[PDB]
């Protein structure tokens, strides 16, 4: 769909069981079959499980630029994701929304893979 | 392999018709069959082609932490990759950064990045 | 005092009056007359005025390292500051606390200067 | 001066007795008597002394935005400074980064950084 973009990423599929979060990250390149922003975002963060599951992230959004403009190519920010209807695999897998109203649909594989789609409330 | 970790990511497979760079990113979770650092790095940047191609990145390395220690969970840095080992034109290939880490990547026609990463530091 | 560190920074002393925040930043080097962490944090952000005044920031915390360890010298994060008892000068000047329970006492000067003290709830 | 902006910051004035670098940071708000970009940059990094001294930094450039646009308010990058114009040992002096910007700084004995910054880009 016009609003959805592919994501792929990785997570720690054998996380510590000592109270620590589960490290993960993913990337969206902002091209789909409808639009192309010539940019890519990576989110790096951790999954915090339980009934009030969260994925807390920081992100880097790099736009393709000329070399002369490369100094201003990368935005930084932070997103917190809340799971709709809340193992790390089962914990992460599902639909999530962030504070902007963006939506993150993800499946976590047994091998550490993250796959899914992202819809941003802003940009593009 | 002991020192290699899986990566995946995405890149702009139809970059602007105008001298831009090609936006991209990828992730490594630092677990393999030998070690687990309970952490993940994402690199965000752009590929700059030509005679001496480069991938210029900034990265975020998040470690799993308690919520109380989350304030100190994330390192930030910057890596520049070239194909010079301390080659065909394009992103696909073997790249090395300023630390001597090895990034071996395949770029699929429709935007996928897949490969392996071997870090010269950490773990 | 043992818990307090000097800060200095700068703010836009003639900000846009079009709904935009007021850009600012400051630095703490984590040495006082009691402790030295051999590190420094910079906060970069904006002041959002009104009765529910906020300073929203991202920060970089660099520790002194050897060259071999420089790759792991810098932490990144984000702090949101709430004003205790809420011009940009008057708006910014006061006592603020962040989500960690740290406290930021600042005076904004007519020339764009920020001066004050910082007490961190964590680290050191 | 038209192209110079005020900076202040702080540095560790008693760095570790052990080969560390000296942690430091500074801020420029991009308002002077000529222009106002409604933005501020902070540089966080460390000074590495010796024969060819360096200040290695990462920076955050926040622009004043509406709250709705705050997600895109902050650029991040990295600057490396040397004293080579495109000198006495220490932080105090005139430094240049890879963009050709000029950072003129005085380091006070007890941790103050003061000076001016002229950017080769932006504004
Ligand atoms: O405009 C672009 O270049 C592409 C869209 C970027 C949207 C960003 S990604 C980080 C932040 N979190 C979101 O959910 N949306 C924005
Ligand atoms: O120690 C860890 O938590 C995992 C290894 C991290 C290595 C980092 S990733 C960013 C930087 N670039 C590299 O090539 N290595 C380091
Ligand atoms: O441990 C250190 O190296 C010095 C103290 C660092 C405390 C950091 S600064 C960013 C974050 N916000 C706070 O209020 N405290 C932490
Ligand atoms: O355009 C602006 O908002 C103000 C000028 C910003 C210039 C930036 S600061 C980080 C980077 N390093 C430099 O020397 N210049 C750019």
- Read off the DSSP letter of residue B64: P
Q: How many helices (H) and strands (E) does chain C have?
A: 1, 8
Residue with tokens 């959805």: A4
Residue with tokens 């999954």: A47
Give the mutation target among A4, A5, A62, A120 for probing the ligand 1 site: most ligand atoms within 8 A of CB.
A120
Residues 45-104, chain C, touching D (beta carbon < 8 A): 45-46, 48, 56-67, 70, 73-74
Question: What's the burial of D35, exposed, middle or buried (CB within 10 Å: 0-12/13-18/19+)?
Answer: exposed
- Read off the DSSP letter of residue A4: -
The parent domain of residue C77 ranges over 1-124
CB B92 within 8 A of CB B114: no
- Binary contact (A8, B12; C-beta < 8 A): no
CB D113 within 8 A of CB D26: yes
- The DSSP H or E segment spanning C90 is helix C88-92
Instruction: Please give, one letter per residue, the 3-state secondary structure of chain D.
Output: CCCCEEEEEEECCCCCCCCCCEEEEEEEEEECCCCEEEEEEEEEEEEECCCCCEEEEEEEEEECCCHHHHHHCEEEEEEEEECCCCCCCCCCEEEEECCCCEEEEEECCCCEEEEEEECCCCC
Residues of chain A in contact with residue B48, where contact means CB-CB under 8 angstroms, are: 67
How many domains would you assign to chain C? 1
Residue D34 sits in a domain whose CATH number is 2.40.128.30
- Total Cβ atoms within 10 A of residue D6: 17
- Read off the DSSP letter of residue A64: P
> Does B30 contact ligand 2 (Cβ within 6 A)?
yes
Resolution in A: 1.0
Mutation pick from D70, D71, D72, D75 vs chain A, by most beta carbons of A within 10 Å, is: D71
D43 is in an annotated binding site: yes
Residues of chain D in contact with residue A123, where contact means CB-CB under 8 angstroms, are: 71-72
Out of C77, C100, C123, whose CB is closest to B74?
A: C77
CB D32 within 8 A of CB D50: no
Find residue A120's DSSP bridge partners: none
- For residue C68, the SS3 value is coil
Find residue D25's DSSP bridge partners: D10, D44
Q: CB contact, 8 Å: C15 with chain D?
A: yes
Can you say which residues of B are annotated as belonging to the binding site for biotin? 5, 43, 59, 71, 117
| Closest-CA residue of chain D to A75 | D75
CA angle C77–B60–C114, rounded 5-degree value:
30
Q: Tokens at residue D21, please? A: 């670098």
**B23 vs B56: CA distance, rounded Å:** 10
């Amino acid at each position: 769909a016009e609003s959805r973009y592919v994501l792929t990423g990785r997570y720690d599929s054998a996380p510590a069981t000592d109270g620590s979060g589960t490290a993960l990250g993913w990337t969206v390149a902002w091209k789909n079959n409808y639009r192309n922003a010539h940019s890519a975002t990576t989110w790096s963060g951790q999954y915090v499980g339980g009934a009030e599951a969260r994925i807390n992230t920081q992100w880097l959004l790099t736009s393709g630029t000329t070399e002369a403009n490369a100094w201003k190519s990368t935005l930084v920010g932070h997103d917190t994701f809340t799971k709709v209807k809340p193992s790390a695999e089962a914990g992460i897998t599902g639909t999530w929304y962030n504070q902007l109203g963006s939506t993150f649909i993800v499946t976590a594989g047994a091998d550490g893979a993250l796959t899914g789609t992202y819809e941003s409330a802003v940009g593009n």
